[PDB]
Amino acid sequence: GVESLNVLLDNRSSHYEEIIASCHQGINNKLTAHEVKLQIEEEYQVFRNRLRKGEITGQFLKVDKSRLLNDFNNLYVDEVTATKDNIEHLIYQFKRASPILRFLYANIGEGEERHHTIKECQMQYWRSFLNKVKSLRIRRKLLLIFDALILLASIHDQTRHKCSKGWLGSCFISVNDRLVSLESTKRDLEKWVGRRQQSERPPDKNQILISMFQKTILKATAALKDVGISVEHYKINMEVICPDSYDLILNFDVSGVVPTISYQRTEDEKFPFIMGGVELLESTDLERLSSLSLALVNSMKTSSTCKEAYCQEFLLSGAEFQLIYQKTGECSKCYAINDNRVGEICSFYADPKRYFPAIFSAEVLQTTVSTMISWVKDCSELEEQLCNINSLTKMILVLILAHPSKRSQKLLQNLRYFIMAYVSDYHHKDLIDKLREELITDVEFLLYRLVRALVNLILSEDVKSMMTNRFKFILNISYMCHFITKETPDRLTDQIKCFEKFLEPKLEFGHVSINPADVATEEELDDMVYNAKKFLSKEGCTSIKGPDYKKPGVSKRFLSLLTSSFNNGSLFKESEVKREIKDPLVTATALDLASNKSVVVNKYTDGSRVLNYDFNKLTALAVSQLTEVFSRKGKHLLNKQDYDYKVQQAMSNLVLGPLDGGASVYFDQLKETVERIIDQYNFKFDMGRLSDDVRISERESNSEALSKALSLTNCTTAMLKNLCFYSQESPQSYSSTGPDTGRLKFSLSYKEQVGGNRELYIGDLRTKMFTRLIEDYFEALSLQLSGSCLNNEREFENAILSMKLNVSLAHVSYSMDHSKWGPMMCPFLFLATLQNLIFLSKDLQADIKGRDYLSTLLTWHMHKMVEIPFNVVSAMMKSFIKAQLGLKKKTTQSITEDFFYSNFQIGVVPSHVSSILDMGQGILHNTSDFYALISERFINYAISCICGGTIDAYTSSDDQISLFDQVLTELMQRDPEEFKTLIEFHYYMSDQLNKFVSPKSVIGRFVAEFKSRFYVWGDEVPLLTKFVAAALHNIKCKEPHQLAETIDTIIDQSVANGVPVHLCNLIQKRTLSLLQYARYPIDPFLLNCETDVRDWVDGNRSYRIMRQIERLIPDACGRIRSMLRKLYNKLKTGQLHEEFTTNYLSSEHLSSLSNLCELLGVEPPSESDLEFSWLNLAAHHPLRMVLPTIVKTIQNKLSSTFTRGAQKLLSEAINKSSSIASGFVGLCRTLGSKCVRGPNKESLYIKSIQSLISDIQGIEPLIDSHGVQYWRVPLNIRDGNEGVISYFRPLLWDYMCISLSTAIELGAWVLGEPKKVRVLEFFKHNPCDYFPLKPAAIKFLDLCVALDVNCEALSLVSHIVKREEHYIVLSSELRLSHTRTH
Ligand SMILES: [Mg+2]
Ligand SMILES: [Zn+2]
């Protein structure tokens, strides 16, 4: 599917050949393998001679540790002036930085009063009951009758044991976590009952209240009994309605501290309690932080619904505090902390999200800090000052967790580059200027001081004993950056930076074409030709001035040298000379485009498509938005006599209509546009219509776009060609710019990355099909050769082996990195390189045809159009319109803003941007990889033919590791002035080919780093912090059986790198505790929290559940565990194979199990062993997460090769249907609403099933220590009551079938005997030692296929369609493991 372009009518008259002539004029790609050496030698000679005198700059220095340390110490001396800070002062001032940090260390607490808090009175029960009633459907009447009952309950329960919990001053929380007063409600009730009494005018003032209360109670009970849930299980005392109720309310008195939140800075400088009394050694502050973070996260449940107040209670070591806020939704707001004994402890302005990683993780952090400290305790010279390290690490962790910012991420992230350059031999001089950020708040400077004090302590100039544990310590500290987030604080603020990045390098080159208009103008062609000519006019090392680094452009001489060298077979190894280069022209599916991405749809008002924005509508929208944002803010904080208010009021009086020494002309001419707009169509028109009209290219999802495109064809195959060249809407002829359907179009977006933010170009569908052809072509042609690791898997292992071998012999390594790889490449370079290669085959015609098709495709991509986001245009228009008659801000005028202004004050406004110096970021990956491979091979060959050494390369897109040989390493130690100039020539000659080296490169003899894989001599570097941070906040709003396997895979992957097993057990326990908060009945299938090391390296997922089940009921699986051995012995040989498949697989379960046990001459299981059962919800239909799967997956994988099957799959995917904390809130809310499917048709609850089980007095629950519920039921109740026993499932049958399947899928050591060995002696061990290990590696196939459908609790075949190769584990964790005989 490469030569299908011959179906269209060619039209390539005049524009096409000029570019070819420009790119093929002076490229002498015919040199031999003997002339290039002369040019290379002469270039080397002239470069060295010019460098010796000093007309060229080096950009490479020799490492000196003292200067590096001093420069790091003196890195921020403009606001933080100091020389050395004492640890005691840092500790003293750390506990008093911010209210959040001051609250976690105060001396708070109270005896028996805190013991009463372990009890719940008759006040919260009524609150929960009324919340449940209000959840269903049954207006001030309801609120009054609902918040009076809880008041009555509190009054009743305040005269029995003298306790008042759930109060604040004179306020009480009633229904929606609200805060309501006392007197106002009393008088409202009095007036409402007075109106009732007036309407009734024998009845008394105490009878109407009880009558209405009982009228509501019966309706509530009927409503709860209608669905199927009981009412008497809530434990509510109905006697709270006293006979004398009306007079009870009106004679109540109470006294307390009146609460009030603050909004300024000077109101939080008064602290009631002691400012600090907690030591860092214990884990007291972590529990408080966890509770506060949970309270903050829970603050998003509130719906829309004096004025308002919302509250959330939380306990702390007996005490009870309340977090109060005054605005709903999910965004930045004001929070205050209150108590009932004092008032307004503190107040802050935190954000509800970005607070997930600390919810129930209070012992994982302590353990990881302990295991990080345990890495350096064996240093003789670092014995005295050991507690300071622990304290500093604790402060760093607590500070990063308590104040999640974005500029604190870039500070801990850059320490890795410094520590990599510390143990190296050479480094770029522009390295210090790269480790510098812009800090604003007073907290980040404290973090910088803390990390500086820690680095100056760990890396002093008098300790050289280990020199390996400190490296791991610093590198793992630098990886705490992953603990915060990967989201973005704002949206508009981070959308202008991307546009400025996109437009910055394209303006200096002086080539910015704004509006192509889809019919190219003569000036556009002339400018494109001139820029193409200019792009190939780079000179260097042979001129009057010399080279000019860091500029876009390519030299003709080096391009000719590269092409000639490639065409002579001089860049090939000894294995490629045994064959001939193949052309993939003659040697795919379209459903791939249905992936989980986005797409853009066009819009036509006529035969043509709109491409330009309107001017008057944009002005009207800008004025409307300014008035909208003004109406509230400028009405309060603007002086009436001020000019700004006087002019903004006039501006507001232009659209709504409910001293001019400034811009009189502008204000006089702006009236007409608004008047015409309002005449042409509480505003005076429709905002929605205007917003829809101004938008030109709305977005749309991916699946339905493909479905609607496919639903108008007549081909019975799902191929790429059938959707593009054959349709009712297909191009007829194609021209120089593009097909008659129009030129290509893209749109801009940003990714979500830790640190910076990458670009993203998202195109339409036609471009999506067009790109894949070139993508696949270049991918195959690069796969022909060896050297690329972008998609390969084995060469990555080969590179790892090479790195290990190089490090083992102390050879020199070079870790590289290229900058601006995306926004400064060009498709013209690819076209010019393609037009000079010789894919030698004995067929000229096919080569010419393929080259022509590739050339025209590259030309099509050369004339692409790029869209400008709507929000950026709106913001720029607001800035222009406001700062033309007003004087509001006018602070900074960036060079990227005058570009909008100059075009604004000419008439039409910018719509698109087109140019030549931009390559699609993440679009043409394979072409760039292939070019990089060729260029690196040529550079290595040149360096080889200059000096007497050889160099390797493992380039992958933009990354590189280079491994020098022995000769270069020996040369580096005896002639530094030669090695340095060789490096200089390498840098210059790499720059000459449009490849720029970043200042973060390393030339080291101690560590190698390729794709974030550090290697040293002997030891290994486990990124424990990265894995822990990734595993912490990695849950979504899925069904609770997919999260278990999602976390299990992550833990299995992380175990194989060096993480101990106790951390994994704690993480799994935290996950189970998080699930328990949602009140989900745990089954013995989710997770196992007692795994040893053999359960991760030898056993698979199915073995851990087997081990967990083997512990719940012992002495009952032993009988089965020998019948299974006999069955395996008689089945592997081929004895029976008949009745087990049909007479024992599809029948009654218990009877068949007993018969199977009896048949093999083995004692049948005891009668009191089949009584064990477990509850399995959704045993009939799957749960409703939104408000046989094996055969269906096989169908979706095979029948989707045609049109109808693919369409059905797309329809089902469409009919399937923000944050991480929002996902948790959604999971908590959804799991508990209905989440139940009935037998025939209905929706039920979870509480109803529990009530039904509690009703029958024959079922007994059993709980494990961590908590896994499993039931015991008698055989006599096996049937007769089938209403609820349907959901239960037996235990021994599933255990047997899963054990048999696991024995089939692995060896036979599983059915041995578990004899946990622990009689081994003791040893003072070291936490730094590792041992590589390997895994434990027809009728059986269809046997497993048939067995898969019966025991439907897991999906074993799902895990098949990766498998880890080697496992690296400690030595002390490898001994104490279970052992089993064959
Ligand atoms: Mg790298
Ligand atoms: Zn009480």
Q: How far is CA 1333 from the centre of its chain?
A: 32
**1297 among the known binding-site residues?**
no
Selection from 1227, 1131, 1146, 1159 nearest residue 1187 by Cα: 1227
Question: E strand or H helix at 867, and its extent?
Answer: strand 865-867
Q: How far is the CA of 121 from the centre of ligand 2 (A)?
A: 5
CA–centroid distance, 120 to ligand 2, in Å, is 6
Q: Which two tokens stand for residue 915?
A: 């140019």
Angstrom distance (rounded) from CA 908 to CA 622: 16
**Experimental method of this PDB entry:** cryo-EM
Residue 958 among known ligand-binding residues:
yes
Task: HSE, CB side, 13 Å, CA atoms: give it for residue 352.
Answer: 23
* Encoded amino acid at 556, one letter: K
Query: Do residues 115 and 318 make contact, with C-beta atoms less than 8 angstroms apart?
Result: yes
Q: How far apart are CA 1098 and CA 1101, in angstroms?
A: 10
Could you give the 3-state DSSP secondary structure of residue 769? helix
* Cα–Cα dist 175/31, whole Å: 87
- Give 933's DSSP letter: H
Give the span between the Cα atoms of 957 and 173, in whole angstroms. 60
Beta strand residue intervals within 2-88, DSSP E: 9-10, 61-62
According to DSSP, the β-strands at 1270-1272 and 1014-1015 are unpaired
What region, left, alpha or beta, does residue 37 occupy, with left being phi > 0 and alpha being psi -120 to 50 degrees? alpha
Separation of alpha carbons 612 and 912, rounded Å: 8
Which ligand is closest to the CA of 1001, given by its number?
Answer: 1
CA dihedral 213, 218, 223, 224 (to 10 degrees): 90
Asked if 458 and 470 touch (Cβ cutoff 8 Å), the reply is yes
Report how far ligand 1's centroid is from the alpha carbon of 507 (Å).
30
From the list 117, 179, 114, 123, the residue with the least C-alpha distance to 151 is: 123
C-beta neighbour count of 469 within 10 angstroms: 20
What whole-number distance in Å separates Cα of residue 296 and Cα of residue 299? Answer: 5
User: In whole angstroms, what is the distance from residue 999 CA to residue 986 CA?
Assistant: 15
Residue 269 marked as a ligand binder: no
CA of 110 from ligand 2 middle (Å) equals 17
CA distance 835 to 838: 9
Task: List the 759-763 sheet strands across, edge first.
Answer: 759-763, 745-750, 865-867, 912-913
Query: Which one of the ligands is nearest to 789 CA?
Result: 1
Please, which residues have CB within 8 angstroms of residue 311's CB and are 6 or more apart in sequence? 168, 173, 177, 178, 179, 322, 323, 324
Grouping H, G, I as helix, E, B as strand and the rest as coil, residue 203 is coil
Please tell me the number of the ligand nearest to residue 818's CA: 1
| 692 annotated among ligand-binding-site residues | no
Residue 163 CA to ligand 2 center (angstroms) comes to 5
Q: Residue 429 carries which side chain, given as an amino acid letter?
A: K
Q: Distance from the CA of 153 to the center of ligand 2, in angstroms?
A: 12
Which residues make Cβ contacts (< 8 Å) with residue 1308, sequence separation at least 6?
Answer: 1128, 1382
- In 3-state terms, what secondary structure has residue 410? helix
* Phi-psi domain of 1018 (left: phi exceeds 0; alpha: psi -120 through 50; beta: other): left
Q: Which residues lie across from 1172 on neighbouring strands?
A: 1272
Within its chain, how far is the Cα of 104 from the centroid?
29
The reply, when asked if residue 1228 is annotated as ligand binding, is no
Ligand closest to CA 960: 1
End-to-end CA distance of the chain: 55
Is 779 annotated in a binding site? The answer is yes
| Inter-residue contact 147 to 175 (CB < 8 Å) | yes
CA of 329 from ligand 2 middle (Å) equals 33
CA angle 233, 235, 238 (to 5 degrees): 115
Taking residue 1024's Cβ as centre, other Cβ atoms within 10 Å add up to 21
Instruction: Report helix, strand or coil for 294.
Output: helix
Closest-lying ligand to the alpha carbon of 959? 1
Residue type, position 759, single letter: E
Distance 171 CA to ligand 2 centre (A): 18
Ligand 1 centroid to Cα of residue 1009, in Å, is 6
> Where do the domains of the chain lie?
1-56+487-613+696-868+911-992, 113-249, 614-695+869-910
To the question of whether residue 119 is assigned a binding role by annotation, the answer is yes
Distance CA 1106, CA 1200 (A): 37
Report the distance separating Cα 682 and Cα 684, nearest Å: 7
Distance 1244 CA to ligand 1 centre (A): 55
* Tokens matching residue 567: 């065409």
CB 941 within 8 A of CB 570: yes
Task: Compute φ and ψ for 749, nearest 5 degrees.
Answer: -155, 175
Query: Which amino acid type is present at position 1369?
Result: V
What's the gap in Å between 959 CA and the centre of ligand 1?
A: 5
Residue 816 marked in a binding site:
yes
Rg value, the chain, Cα: 37
Closest CA to 361 of 1071, 1220, 1265: 1071
Question: Does the annotation flag 161 for ligand binding?
Answer: yes
Closest among 139, 150, 138 to 175, alpha carbons compared: 150
Span from the CA of 50 to the centroid of ligand 1 (angstroms): 32
Residue 650: in which H helix or E strand, if any? Answer: helix 643-652
1325 is in an annotated binding site: no
Contact 372, 366 (CB under 8 A): no
**How far is the centre of ligand 2, averaged over its atoms, from the C-alpha of 343 (Å)?**
22
Two tokens at 106? 């105060």
Query: In 3D, which of 1290, 434, 1354 has the Cα closest to residue 817?
Result: 434
